[PDB]
Amino acid sequence: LQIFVKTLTGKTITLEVEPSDTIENVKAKIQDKEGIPPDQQRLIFAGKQLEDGRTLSDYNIQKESTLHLVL
Ligand SMILES: [Cl-]
Incomplete structure (x- = not known):
């Protein structure tokens, strides 16, 4: 992927x-x-905040999806 x-x-x-x-x-x-550093990373996909213990498939993240690092 x-x-x-x-x-x-x-x-x-x-x-x-x-x-x-x-x-x-x-x-x-x-x-x-x-x-x-991982503890400074906060990731968003399609406006959804991504949680460390969940998987990409939990969020419907697919090929060529773009995630964003945010404050
Ligand atoms: Cl693993």
Whole structure:
């Protein structure tokens, strides 16, 4: 599954994940890519706040979906 994550400057991160990856797993991938600590990351998809212990499939996140890092 390929997804995009936009940082707070609009920089695009491209990630490879599985549909049942947790948001915690995605946060670790963003940390590796950009150095942003997971506890400072807050992710939104289609206006929905994503929780660390839930999965991408729980939120209907699909191929080429874009997630946003927010304050
Ligand atoms: Cl896992």
